[PDB]
Design a protein around this ligand. Structure first.
Ligand SMILES: CCCCCCCC/N=C1\OC[C@@H]2[C@H](O)[C@H](O)[C@@H](O)[C@H](O)N12
Length: 442
């Protein structure tokens, strides 16, 4: 039962700016597309917005004290593009820079390693008005935004992530229309995919110029897809879902100079005519791949769709996502086998459960603990088999605004009572503190 990780393995927790900060317009900040999206009726459960969230914009110091109290060694957090550049490019908001400098300086005082996600979905509204990720010019808008971050924070932050989950940004935001900017156009969605890559690569190239002794990567969402049967088309359906939904959509471009074969077969018509002229730039060398993982999915070829998900009789979280720990093992083995990145991090893994504050005033969330434990164990197996996993980040430090689900879905290892903004460390929080102390499971 004992599973000790490698010396130096990095144990962390993650958040994203829009999800926890509140005060979205504080101190001259521009609107983001999530401000405008969640202020549109019908877009978010219960009409929830990130106006307040966890009030981290004012409670940042105390939230960091929670990380330090738990002994957690890394903090993955994102930067709000419009707090720094209210108009997307040009004028810099010094008070925005100031908010993150304090967080950065405090983290380092306490021996916590900052991982900064440059973009975790809160694009400036002003850039959305000029087409956002649909606009080829965003590769350069993003370059200028990245440079400003590297210049200001790069002396102290040495670990960077360009994009959180570009598949989600492109597809859930511009095809399914479930996330900002709330569009449903497949031609726009594959131009977003392509522009995300070009942006990512430009930022990495500016990074080599502006930051010394630092490492930069990119973070992908990933599902463990399994075939509903051993029928040939079901096995093919799984290949497509892995190539499309998982890291290959972007790493094939990055490591190989082109999109995956089944994605070209499906979507060549939706990509720009001469997209391949952009591939040699997109192959800008990266230092690590961040994989987020939450769930397993059974998949089948379905002519009325051409792939459908098929619900399994398996344990689920409060999202209805199936809990399939071996998935994080499969995806870790797979990424090495296919692309052999020199370094990998689990940049998100976690679970939403219907947490209860007990009469004792504690939050006993053994179910979240069970979820995290099973996944960490499977992660450990992947290391024993040669995967260079360098760290593990729990999603999330705090219960927060879960995008289109609003506040009703709680991912925290720390409970937030939104009537008072009071934090209560959950049992999972204490458990995770011990994992870090023991560098593993005992
Ligand atoms: C049933 C099919 C849908 C499966 C959805 C898979 C889970 C989605 N993943 C996440 O679940 C929670 C977490 C956060 O929303 C975070 O900001 C994102 O970076 C990341 O996407 N997060």
């Amino acid at each position: 039962n004992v599973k000790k990780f490698p010396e130096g393995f990095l144990w962390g927790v993650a958040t994203a700016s829009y999800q926890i900060e509140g005060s979205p317009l504080a101190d001259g900040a521009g609107m983001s597309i999530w401000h405008t999206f969640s202020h549109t009726p019908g877009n978010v459960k219960n009409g929830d917005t990130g106006d307040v969230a966890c009030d981290h914009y004012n409670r940042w110091k105390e939230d960091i004290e929670i990380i330090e109290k738990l002994g957690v060694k890394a903090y993955r957090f994102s930067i709000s593009w419009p707090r720094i550049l209210p108009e997307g490019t040009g004028r810099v908001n010094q008070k925005g820079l100031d908010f993150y400098n304090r967080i950065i300086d405090t983290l380092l005082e306490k021996g916590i390693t900052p991982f900064v996600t440059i973009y975790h979905w809160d694009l400036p509204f002003a850039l959305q008005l000029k087409g956002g990720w649909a606009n080829r010019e965003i590769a350069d808008w993003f370059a200028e935004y990245s440079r400003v971050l590297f210049e200001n924070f790069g002396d102290r932050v040495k670990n960077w992530i360009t994009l959180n989950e570009p598949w989600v940004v492109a597809i859930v935001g511009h095809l399914y229309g479930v996330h900002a900017p709330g569009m449903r156009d497949i031609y726009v969605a594959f131009r977003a995919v392509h522009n995300l890559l070009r942006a990512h690569a430009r930022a990495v190239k500016v990074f080599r110029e502006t930051v010394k002794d630092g490492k930069i990567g990119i973070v992908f969402n990933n599902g463990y897809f399994e075939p509903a049967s051993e029928k040939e088309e079901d096995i093919r359906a799984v290949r497509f879902m892995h190539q499309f939904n998982n890291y290959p959509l972007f790493l094939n471009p990055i490591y190989r100079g082109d999109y995956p074969e089944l994605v070209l077969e499906f979507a060549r018509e939706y990509l720009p005519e001469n997209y391949k002229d952009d591939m040699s730039e997109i192959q800008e060398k990266i230092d690590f791949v961040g994989l987020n993982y939450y769930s397993g999915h059974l998949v089948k070829f379905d002519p009325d769709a051409k792939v459908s998900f098929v619900e399994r009789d398996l344990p689920k979280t409060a999202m209805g996502w199936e809990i399939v720990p071996e998935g994080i093992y499969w995806i870790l083995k797979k990424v090495k086998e296919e692309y052999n990145p020199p370094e990998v991090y689990i940049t998100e893994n976690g679970a939403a459960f219907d947490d209860v504050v007990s009469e004792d005033g504690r939050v006993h969330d053994q179910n979240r603990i069970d979820y995290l434990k099973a996944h960490i164990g499977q992660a450990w197996k992947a290391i024993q088999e040669g995967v260079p996993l360098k760290g593990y980040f729990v999603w999330s430090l705090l219960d927060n605004f879960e995008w289109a689900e609003g506040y009703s879905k709680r991912f925290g290892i720390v409970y937030v009572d939104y009537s008072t903004q009071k934090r209560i460390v959950k049992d999972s929080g204490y458990w995770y503190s011990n994992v870090v102390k023991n560098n593993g499971l005992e």
